[PDB]
Chains A and B, each alone.
Chain A
């Protein structure tokens, strides 16, 4: 099993916060870097950032640095992605992804979660 267990769909008020959790299973949680990518239902797909369970270092794009934070939890073998202001522009299905790379941070993103649907309403 390399299947990622991903949290259920959440609906949020606009402007507020939301957190998405992905639970790793089967594979070694430590070295394998975990990226976070968003897919809006309109079109396309975009990449936010990664958390590594080994060191806990983060990186982000300019579009999300200072607006969204990520964290790990090695106790339950899970990593959390937090969004500060759930704008109406951010209604998307958020995907958590693993790289082929063992302890290095190449962006070879292989196995993806089932899809936590995030909805922003008004």
Chain B
């Protein structure tokens, strides 16, 4: 186990110093946006370490 510890994998732009991006807003496809659905395109930004 120990899947509690997450880390952000994809973001639209690099962080400012001491930034805290708590939002799990879905990443941008490059194509037309995905207004709240995962899949092919607009993937989920977080990722569990394991």
* Contact call B40/A105, Cβ cutoff below 8 A: yes
Question: In the complex, what's the smallest C-beta–C-beta distance from A44 to chain B, in angstroms?
Answer: 22
Interface of A is mostly: loop
Q: Do A103 and B37 touch across chains, with their CB atoms under 8 A apart?
A: no
When the two chains form their complex, are residues B40 and A31 in contact, meaning their CB atoms are under 8 A apart? no
A74 touches B47 (CB 8 A): no
* A103 pairs with B40, CB closer than 8 A: no
In the bound complex, CA of A50 to CA of B38 (Å): 10
Query: How many A-B pairs fall under 8 Å by CB?
Result: 43
> What is the bound-complex CA distance between A39 and B4, given in angstroms?
35
Query: In the complex, A49 Cα to B37 Cα: how many Å?
Result: 13
- Size of B's binding interface in residues, CB under 8 A: 15
Assess whether B38 is in contact with A31, with CB atoms less than 8 Å apart: no
Given contact pairs A74-B1, A104-B43, A54 touches B48 in the complex (Cβ within 8 A):
yes
- Interface status of A25 (Cβ within 8 A of chain B): no
Mask of A6-28 contacts with B, CB within 8 angstroms, 1/0: 00000000000000000000001
**Residues of B9-50 whose CB lies within 8 A of A:** 9, 24, 37-40, 43-44, 46-50
B46 touches A105 (CB 8 A): no
Q: Is A106 within 8 A of B40, CB to CB?
A: yes
Cβ contacts A to B, 8 pairs, < 8 Å: A30-B49, A30-B50, A31-B48, A57-B37, A59-B37, A75-B1, A105-B39, A107-B40
